[PDB]
Paper text:
Here we propose a novel method for connecting the pre-existing α-helices of two proteins into a single extended helix using a chemical cross linker. EY-CBS (3,3′-ethyne-1,2-diylbis-{6-[(chloroacetyl)amino]benzenesulfonic acid}) is a chemical cross linker that can react simultaneously with two cysteines in the i and i+11 positions of the α-helix19. To test whether EY-CBS detects the formation of a helix, we chose two amino acid residues separated by 11 amino acids in the proposed fusion helix and mutated them to cysteines. In conclusion, we have developed a new method that can convert two pre-existing α-helices into one long extended helix.
Author numbering: 217 to 267, 1005 to 1077
């Protein structure tokens, strides 16, 4: 309860959060203060997505790692499928292909972290 306390305060005073959002980070950092640095980062991104670039990239990396299970810095068509069918969805292997193709810049059949970034940026 030393650097925890700091983050706590900082979240309290992040201007742009609404008080439902504020409340979320707060009581959740109470139940698990070991997670202090991570909740601050997420809120920092939530509050100013332009100003909190590193914190957004931070969180977005962990999102990447979720699909990129073998960790070769790339999301294959298979890894997409592997993740999705684990979520009870049943895609035809032709939609998995259309889903990668729809966010693939250099058109090499997979998805790199920069391409991943663009997709996130796009909606919103
Ligand atoms: Ca991979
Ligand atoms: Ca690519």
């Amino acid at each position: 309860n030393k650097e925890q306390q700091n983050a706590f305060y900082e979240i309290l005073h992040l201007p742009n959060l609404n008080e439902e959002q504020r409340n979320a980070f707060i009581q959740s950092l109470k139940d698990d203060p070991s997670q202090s640095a991570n909740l601050l980062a997420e809120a920092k991104c939530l509050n100013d997505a332009q100003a909190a670039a590193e914190e957004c990239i931070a969180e977005f990396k962990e999102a990447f790692s979720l699909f990129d299970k073998d960790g070769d810095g790339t999301i294959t068509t298979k890894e997409l499928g592997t993740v999705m069918r684990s979520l009870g969805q049943n895609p035809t292997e032709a939609e998995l292909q259309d889903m990668i193709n729809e966010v693939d810049a250099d058109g090499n059949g997979t998805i790199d972290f920069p391409e991943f970034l663009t997709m996130m940026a796009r909606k919103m």
